[PDB]
Design a protein around this nucleic acid. Structure first.
Length: 282
DNA sequence: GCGCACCGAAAGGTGCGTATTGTCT
């Protein structure tokens, strides 16, 4: 699954909280700023604030006071539940790497869509810059503490133009290509998983799960999905036609805030829960 | 954006809207 969220000032705290190698940089732009490997939270927070730091002018001054300033674009990649289970409960580390690769390859294509504007004598040109500064953060649990392999790819609101100037990203091409990029993540992941010897079961939506784990077992580890379904059922709503407002209310209002927890103990719970659900990881 | 109004200063820049699968941000 792939979803996007345009990040603004009010979300700078949320974006900052996202922080082998669970936090990694990516993007020709990142390279341009000398960023590689693990993400430095300090540099990350300022970049979100629009600070190139190299003693350059702060960015996005042209932002209208009556408009929200944008700090970035979060692309959240989430693996099918069976995949999260095999990687986090069964303990197949290669699945983690498979996910990371699918994310990296998809972001390369999102980067090929990076654009910015330039106005010369009243004439505006849309330039495909092809470079992004991205902070990738891999996480493993859902808000209900179920295994949930997902990565928050925070594309900062910045890109360097052909004339060497840095400006806000015109996210149009990336945002509108969310469905397509989700399909790319899906394809790459499936390819990587098949290389590991897993068979996949598709269900006519483009989605898939590992063939040896059934739907009831999946649902047994999908508490958030259950909460969303109960919300619609309570409101007497048909999930097939719910408006956007209703969908957002069902997902947000039933969502618990991230808490604390003993990961070692949680893993043990997962394994015991899997046995109870009769899952055979092979 | 379906080009505007409004920001800063570069006869220049930005938000805005965009998005809509599920494992459920």
């Amino acid at each position: 699954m792939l979803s996007h969220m345009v990040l603004t000032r009010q979300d700078i705290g949320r974006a900052a909280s996202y922080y082998g190698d669970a936090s990694e940089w990516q993007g020709k732009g990142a390279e341009e700023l000398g960023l590689s490997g693990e993400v430095d939270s300090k540099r990350f927070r300022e970049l979100l604030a629009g600070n190139i730091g190299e003693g350059h002018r702060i960015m996005r001054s042209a932002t209208r006071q009556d408009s929200k300033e944008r700090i970035g674009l979060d692309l959240t990649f989430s693996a099918p539940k069976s995949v999260s289970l095999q990687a986090l409960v069964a303990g197949d580390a290669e699945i983690i790497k498979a996910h990371d690769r699918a994310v990296a390859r998809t972001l390369e294509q999102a980067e090929a869509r990076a654009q910015a504007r330039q106005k010369i004598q009243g004439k505006t040109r849309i330039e495909t810059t092809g470079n992004l500064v991205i902070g990738k953060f891999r996480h493993e649990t859902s808000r209900e503490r179920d295994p949930q392999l997902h990565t928050h790819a925070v594309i900062l609101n910045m890109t360097k133009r052909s004339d060497g100037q840095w400006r806000a990203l015109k996210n149009d091409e990336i945002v509108k290509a969310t469905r397509y990029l989700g399909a790319v993540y899906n394809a790459e992941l499936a390819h990587e998983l098949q290389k590991l010897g897993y068979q996949l079961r598709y269900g006519k939506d483009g989605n898939f799960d590992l063939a040896h784990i059934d739907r009831q077992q999946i649902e047994g580890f999908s508490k958030r999905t259950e909460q969303i379904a109960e919300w619609y059922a309570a409101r007497g709503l048909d999930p097939n036609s719910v408006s956007l407002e209703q969908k957002q209310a069902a997902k947000v209002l039933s969502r618990a805030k991230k808490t604390s927890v003993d990961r070692e103990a949680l893993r043990a719970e997962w394994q015991a829960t899997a046995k109870e659900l009769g899952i055979d990881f092979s």
